[PDB]
Symmetry: C5
Subunit: 311 residues, 5 copies
């Protein structure tokens, strides 16, 4: 219950590995994800060394309480991980092979600027604090790093689960702290977003555009203002249920542009009727005819400008 002594003035190397068993509950609002995995740890504690001849065993098993185990913590976790030690195996040279199953709700920022065509890199930061008698440094054993094939996140494609092999060693509260970065790369499954969100939202806008093939101000006011109600009602229906993104998103710019188009279409309908009343039906009919091409063309062009700006 004290760290192993150094042979010379070298730090203790704790080789790590994370193997994803299950990944679940990716919360976009909270920017958190719950993960269930193995955490394999390996280090040399020469005090535990033995002769397999005298012992009559080629490997010894210990209880966590019986031996020194490094305090590995996660940097970006809500509460400490719920861990269960699966196995502890000591070889005759004193090499400890530790294995545990943990479940953790990890906090990792998400960038929704390119939503719903966005990709994310989920982080899991391992950390070890160095002690009084010696310094502890983390390492990655790539043979011990991977993910179960059945690992899934509904609406996401799990690209890869890797680790940045080089640790970040730094001083914190007068002690060395070695930090490791485990990355889970995911890309969104945006298929049903076209028929369920985009297409019906465009149909409602297109219905407002039929006021350019009508001279009735009463029918035109009912067209543009009722489609604005239908649009707002449709936005409540497809609402993300997360608090509004403080920054401007791709989908957010399109929806803002759609609100601008309902305002510009009201301005046209109001101008058309005012010119018709103010004995100028030549200008009223020429504006309404221009709008039939101007509205879809300006819309198509502005969407290409946004798509270019965001991608």
């Amino acid at each position: 219950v004290s760290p192993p002594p150094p042979i010379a003035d070298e730090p203790l190397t704790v080789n790590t590995g994370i193997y994803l068993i299950e990944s679940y509950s990716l919360d976009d609002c909270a920017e958190t994800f719950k993960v269930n995995a193995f955490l394999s740890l390996s280090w040399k504690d020469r005090r535990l060394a033995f002769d397999p001849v005298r012992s009559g065993v080629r490997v010894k098993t210990y209880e966590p309480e019986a031996i020194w185990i490094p305090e590995i913590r996660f940097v970006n976790v809500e509460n400490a991980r719920d861990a269960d030690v699966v196995d502890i195996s000591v070889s005759p040279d004193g090499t400890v092979q530790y294995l545990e199953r943990f479940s953790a709700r990890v906090l990792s920022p998400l960038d929704f600027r390119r939503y719903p065509f966005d990709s994310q890199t989920l982080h899991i930061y391992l950390i070890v604090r160095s002690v009084d008698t010696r310094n502890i440094v983390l390492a990655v054993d790539l043979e011990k790093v991977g993910k179960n094939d059945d690992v899934f996140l509904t609406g996401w494609d799990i690209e890869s689960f890797t680790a940045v092999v080089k640790p970040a060693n730094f001083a914190l509260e007068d002690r060395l702290e070695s930090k490791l970065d485990y990355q889970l790369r995911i890309s969104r499954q945006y298929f049903s977003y076209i028929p369920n969100i985009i297409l019906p939202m465009l149909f409602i806008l297109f219905i407002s555009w039929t006021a350019f093939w009508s001279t009735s101000y009463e029918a035109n006011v009912t067209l543009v203002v009722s489609t604005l109600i239908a649009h707002i009602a449709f936005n409540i229906l497809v609402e993300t249920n997360c608090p509004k993104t403080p920054y401007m998103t791709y989908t957010g710019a399109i929806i803002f542009m759609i609100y601008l188009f309902y305002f510009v279409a009201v301005i046209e309908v109001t101008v058309q009727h005012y010119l018709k009343v103010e004995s100028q039906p030549a200008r009223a009919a020429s504006i309404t005819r221009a709008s039939r091409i101007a509205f879809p063309v300006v819309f198509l062009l502005a969407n290409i400008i946004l798509a270019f700006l965001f991608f």
Copy 2:
């Protein structure tokens, strides 16, 4: 305590069984279900064998801490199960009869493509990790796999609770792992979905179709656009309260088709009026008369095409 020694070079067989006491909280959004059940374990440990004559007992009881018990874990759980050891009984031959009551929130994918006429197979994966001293293999005693008659999930018919007898034995982090798949087959209770969701949604669409028996553009604009608002408002009312399904569902296709029909009906109403105002009432009246049959026929046929594609 170490694992029991093999008589020959055979692995240790741990006979399992799960008996569902209560099933609750089936979350469609989270794809998780909370279960409370018994987990029975049986294996032979010859070290624990005794003579009932010398001992004066026909069965011995032990505390979990006193004897070797295999570490059985569940693969698809959020956090480790909340377990309470109910009984441990050792017979003179060394047979250990273990029993525990546990509660766990199990993660099981759900396929909503055929919703609300869908059936689901909920999984509970048992797993045991082998040690270096000896290999551990799981077995299913099907007489031990069951469920309480009073077990229920509102809106579902619990068909069966089974296990696939053959375990999935595989290597993971240089050790053998025996995995058992327990299945809970459930089928949805879609009764009230016709009168509460389908019938009122179709009525709103049918009201938009009365514009084919009217020449008033003002009454037709109020018909088709107000029914679109009534439809969107009705969708908000019958909203699933789960984030949108990343894949296209049966119900999702129908609702997309309904949005298309409101757009096509606006196009007709706009064409009818434009042909009437552009001195062509022969073409305007012939289109409106055709729509009276074309709309219900194309709808009925497209539904048959979707029903055929999904089932």
Copy 3:
């Protein structure tokens, strides 16, 4: 720390009592209810019998760890109850009088077919598993069963808290198990249901019926379709916040019937106008006049048919 020995071959009778301190959080969506109560247990253990003369005490008090206590569990709970042992008293004959205060979230199905005039019977199932050396059977001490007068559930009248005195004894995992049924009968007290949900919903329907005293198709389309929107919007306002009931409810049938009446009223308004435009105002006016009586009469009769079917 062994069960008491039988005098003859009789099972151990554990007399139970439950005294409701507080009842709260009745969740209709989850079909669960939280309860805070006393659980009294009484059984005879002749090993604990004493002479009050030699001991100098008429009653002995023990710590739970000092004596044998039967493991009583609840069948229909989410997780095990939060229990705290209040008192353990042993009389000179060996009668143990155990008392504990517990809190538990009990799962009990709810039938909403007669909502909001429904009554429910909430269950709490006690169970004891028999042990190696002897069988354990539950009994009810009616003097120890009851509820605090201040116990309440907002929107419900707590009729009674009783128990089914005869236990359900059966075999489970090769051991006898004795089960007790504790019933809490509650009836809904929703006075405000009529003025807050029914009356405004009927007013919206009655407003659609004013189209029978109007010949204006434009005013009639605005009447029936805007009231349909107002109805749907009112249903969103009075939405139960629980996922839709898989079976058809009383309130559910009325609301379905109301949606049918909005569709039938559109059919009338469409027929009236088509007969008027197709040079038949004799038939148009006779239908509109008939509807003034037919609609309220068919509605009143259909409601009596539903009320008769559900009650």
Copy 4:
């Protein structure tokens, strides 16, 4: 680990005091409030009396396990309080001075009949169960009962925190139980309820009243029915997010009355038009002119009747 012996046949007096550190999460729907506070207990145990000369200490400190401490519980809590013993000090006469910090979710009924001008008295009931060898009675020293100045509940004015000095001593399951009543008096901050809820709700009603200064049935139908939609939509916006109150509230009566006024205004608009079309414009214009005064006067009077009935 036995109660202190009486000098004469007197019960043990346990002096209590609750000091509110933080008050949070007042849930109107659940009728529960989460409180964090100190619980001070004082009682005399002559067995713990000592001579400060021989001991060489003026005060002795003990661990809770070392001495007898009365089992104090709260009656109206969800689960037992989360407690942490802060200090235990024994003076030479045997006086025990116990202090603990606890958090607890207290269940206390709320009366919303006068909402949002309502005041509430939140209760906390301390209770002690008497034992075999002696009776235990609670006492309160109001000098010890208080609250932190920074204690807050958003939207409420915490008037006072007190205790009813006289305990309720009663028999429960053949033992005496002494109960104390702590009371937290709070009154609502209804400031923004006039400009955010009442004022916009009245404006929507007043817009429906402009139909009394119009003869156009088409404009009157659009006025009265669209304001009914705007009212229902506004009620969804200002919805309390708690299930509807089973009893009739003040705000509930006003809103019911507002729904009645939209129905009566439709009846007027329908009568006006029917009298006009049935060659009686003398009666139609006289009703519409009467309504201009009748509607605001009947509204103003009915509100005074409700305000008088509720306050």
Copy 5:
């Protein structure tokens, strides 16, 4: 397991420091924030002093159970913090250097009067209660007060994390209590507020203003009342999801003013039509022409008055 003895009659100084690791879950509705941090404590205990020559070590490490550690608690926490002792180091002079990693959901009031241009000061109040044999006072080690550079709150700019070096010493429950205030200053990221909430809300108001360039009462009623519906529907879309603020906010005043403008615009539309129908088109046209300037000017001025009043 006794506090250290004073050299003279001085109180024990416990030097504190908090180092923010992660900040998450800032709940505006609950006025709580979850934080993960280090808590460093330093105090002198001469009983633990040693000669480094005879002992032969830099610092002596202890288990929390082995030495006296001051009970530091947080004032404004829901439940006690989840703490993990990271390290305890004693230097030759008797200086104890304690370190722990904790997670806590801190309660801190939020002032939304200037929302969404508001800044908040989040508090974490440390407190120590003085003991029998000596008084304990808190201090701040400015070298140990800090925050990780990667600390974030989505939609907020974390300005600073400082501590009020001077503690608040006061009597509580007959004992001295030293309290420290740790402040986390945050300012909101209101960027997407303008295009996502302000601009579409103003467009809906501007559409109602087109009724000043129209004489049609039917088109004007449809303009002002349908935009009121669109506004209310847009408010439901951008609803804060927190229960209503009891005090009047900046955004709250603007939205109240917008509801007043819809009522005043209805009054104009009603007056215009009544003057027109009552043979006075000179006054009707002069009011409608005045409103074209009066409405945007009064709006712009009233907004400047509110902006001045709130900032």
